[PDB]
Amino acid sequence: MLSRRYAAKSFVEWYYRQINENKPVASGYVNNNATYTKAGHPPADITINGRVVATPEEWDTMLKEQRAGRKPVRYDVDCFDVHVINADYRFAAPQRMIEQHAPTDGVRMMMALTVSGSVYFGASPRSTDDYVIKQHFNDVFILVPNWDVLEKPGARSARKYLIASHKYRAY
Amino acid sequence: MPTPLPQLPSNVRDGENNVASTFLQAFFQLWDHDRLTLIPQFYDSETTFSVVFATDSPQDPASSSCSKFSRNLNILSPPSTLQRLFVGSNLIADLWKVLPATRHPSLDQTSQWLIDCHTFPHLADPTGMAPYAMGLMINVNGQCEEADISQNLYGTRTFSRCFILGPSKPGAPHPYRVLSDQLTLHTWKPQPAPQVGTV
């Protein structure tokens, strides 16, 4: 499996598992990371259904707002795809990271991720037929490496790459 | 008590020059009639193109086309149902030919498009004088009229398309280029075929 696809698939799984488990997803954003903040990275660019959001916490709150035997809100990832838009990402990186890892090692890469699926409101946790209303969602992320983690042998795809940009759409 | 998120109008933060609107207008105008000309204009060696299918519609053209493409390619053997397809700079031209004939609406109709876009940092600098360069992400949600003429197949496609725009190489046609093109085809609903009578 491709290194990018693995990171992508895994991030996707975590993210939507966290949303469906009613857990905060702010951690996955570059805003809460200390290294990037120390390096002087802008806050993550989050856009929900056309509304610009200031912080991932606000987005996490919106996710709670939306939730107000049947599950209130559930996300079903139908598909996703990831591209590499920087092979040589060096921002906020220690010096060692640049010399040890090459662009062909599939670690120092800025990724453009797109995810598309459905959104079932007031439906059975396992049924895709019965629902109050069904939306179609299409997410778009820009993922950056987490320099603090790629040193640690232990691996969470959740931390392994961080969100710098987010575009949520649902209709 | 559930209530879906609020659906605001599409905010196009393409700055003061409105480059996104121009690019999109030109791109789809070209995509419809002579898409291949887009490649020398906006595409590069570093460019990458993907097509994904979010759902398995009955007898849709794109699936069959992409299937034939994947089967035809000597480069690998996958089997029956393909969810996605990925190609580098060298096979984009060969893939765009196989894709169905499409007719998109004008951007004047805001009711038909959901275009979100913004500029982000830390892209690569093709000129190589600076470490970083700034890029423009353009996520487009919309629909169009998709058609296969060889078969008698005609219908309406709902889709999402993500463009990653960045600064171009020296001696390029335009000041910018497409770094990544991610196409997602949600659904295909059959529609009546247009007919022309002559005498």
Residue numbers in the entry:
A (entry chain B): 1 to 68, 81 to 183
B (entry chain A): 364 to 441, 444 to 564
Manuscript text:
The ctMex67NTF2L and ctMtr2 chains interacted through their highly curved β-sheets in a pseudo-twofold-symmetric manner in the 2.9 Å resolution crystal structure, similar to that observed in the analogous complexes from H. sapiens and S. cerevisiae. In the complex, ctMtr2 was not altered when compared with the isolated structure, with a Cα r.m.s.d. of 0.38 Å over 148 residues. There was clear density for these loops in the ctMex67NTF2L–Mtr2 crystal structure, but as in hsNXF1NTF2L–NXT1 they did not form an extended surface, suggesting that ctMex67–Mtr2 may not be involved in ribosomal export in C. thermophilum in the quite same way as in S. cerevisiae. In particular, Leu368 was buried in a hydrophobic pocket present in ctMtr2. Notably, Leu368 was positioned in a structurally equivalent position to scMex67Leu263 and hsNXF1Leu370, indicating that the NTF2L pre-α1 loop position may be conserved across species. C. thermophilum Mex67–Mtr2 retained features found in both S. cerevisiae and H. sapiens and conserved the hydrophobic pocket identified as the nucleoporin-binding site found in NTF2L domains from other organisms.
Mtr2 is a ∼15–20 kDa protein that also has an NTF2-like fold and forms a tight heterodimeric complex with the Mex67 NTF2L domain.
